Amino acid sequence: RLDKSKVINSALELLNEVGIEGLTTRKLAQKLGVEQPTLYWHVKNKRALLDALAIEMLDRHHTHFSPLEGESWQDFLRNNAKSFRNALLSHRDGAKVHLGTRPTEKQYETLENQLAFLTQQGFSLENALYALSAVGHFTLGSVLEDQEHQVAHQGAEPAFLHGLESLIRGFEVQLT
Amino acid sequence: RLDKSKVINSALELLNEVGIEGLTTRKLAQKLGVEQPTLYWHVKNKRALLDALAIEMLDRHHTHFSPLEGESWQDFLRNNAKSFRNALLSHRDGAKVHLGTRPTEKQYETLENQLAFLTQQGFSLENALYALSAVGHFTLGSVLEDQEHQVAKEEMPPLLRQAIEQGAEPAFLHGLESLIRGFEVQLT
RNA sequence: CGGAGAAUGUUAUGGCGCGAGCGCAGAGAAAACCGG
């Protein structure tokens, strides 16, 4: 009948059409061909819908949350930022959708596993959390301004890549 | 007796009370004790009000937009970021208010003076725009998550629980240092 | 008090209730309608 699969697939399509500000559960119910009380069992309001959209965009496109076999910490942080940025760009206003959500327990566990990997490579526990925070804040900030100006030099990927590189070589220095 | 000075002063007080999501020109009109048609002459909608609020917090708190006498480019970028961050934190949801406003002509001129200062100090024109953009994106991202976090204070793994033992300023300062110490490398 | 988490509408120079004035409300509105 009507599973979480069609709910979120239709919700992500309507997010692209309308954006985060005009997206309503009523437009999703009409797009799905269901009454609003029926949809309330799968999504209870806009806040719950945005929470689900952000989680789904990460599971779909944030694939490089863990280091690969024999991958340097520099390459890991590099591809962790690119993966996170791809999720935010997977859909319209994806960074705005992500900013309004609260992290699940699985994301905290994933973050602890990242601190473990960084501390294993010579990072202090304090510096390992700062490196991950800085990369996240920079990536989120870059996409937020990029998607805000996407309503209208050009090309935000070079700015992101050169800034991510500035972070990585800065991390290398502060190790010594 | 309703001038632009009292409008934004009341508006920023109202921003702290209700936040960016609950801020409306009608609640501003009610706080000012005027009918909505009267307030329309000074601010035309929420978008115009947010544009004014973002500019006002910068003029008030973004004071270190220019290098001091004999101040290194490292110290300038450091204190330019700290000054910019102070503006975003000056009021509730200040980073969200800033995000979505379009730069005026004076900040383009102010920004040109910043590329000028950086290009003099050895930066390539290309690298000067990358350094300033990265510092801006990092500062904006840090305050956005920081201000989003202290709203969630209406309500975990131990190694993560060992790092939490407390605010966002230490993370901001160290991350800002990672950028600058990285900029030093990319010059050579 | 209930149909009802109704409709419509979004972020308000307007919409609405009472009657210049007082009052209501925002995507889990204010109105309007039906029922005891």
Numbering used by the authors:
A (entry chain B): 3 to 154, 179 to 202
B (entry chain A): 3 to 157, 166 to 175, 180 to 202
Quote the study's own text.
The crystal structure of TetR in complex with the 43-nucleotide-long TetR-binding RNA aptamer K1 was determined at 2.7 Å resolution. The complex consists of one TetR dimer bound to a single aptamer. In the complex, TetR adopts a conformation that is highly similar to the conformation that TetR adopts for DNA binding and which has been extensively characterized before. The aptamer adapts a hairpin-like L-shaped structure in the complex. The two arms of the L-shape consist of a 3 bp-long closing stem P1 and a 4 bp-long P2 stem. Although in the complexed aptamer, the P2 stem is closed-off by an apical GAAA loop on one side, no density is visible for the central two nucleotides of the tetraloop. Overall, 36 nucleotides, i.e. nucleotides 4–22 and 25 to 41, of the 43-nucleotide-long aptamer K1 could be modeled with confidence. A direct consequence of the symmetry disparity between dimeric TetR and the monomeric aptamer is that the two NBDs of TetR interact with two different aptamer surface patches. Arg28 and Arg28′ each form a bidental hydrogen-bonding interaction with a guanine nucleobase, specifically G31 in case of Arg28 and G12 in case of Arg28′.
Eponymous TetR is a homodimeric α-helical protein, and each monomer comprises 10 α-helices. The tertiary structure of TetR family members consists of two domains: an N-terminal nucleotide-binding domain (NBD) and a C-terminal effector-binding domain (EBD) that also contains the dimerization interface. In the absence of its natural ligand tc, TetR binds to the DNA tetO operator sequence and thereby represses downstream genes. Upon tc binding to the EBD, TetR undergoes an allosteric rearrangement that increases the separation of the NBDs, abolishes tetO operator binding and alleviates gene repression.
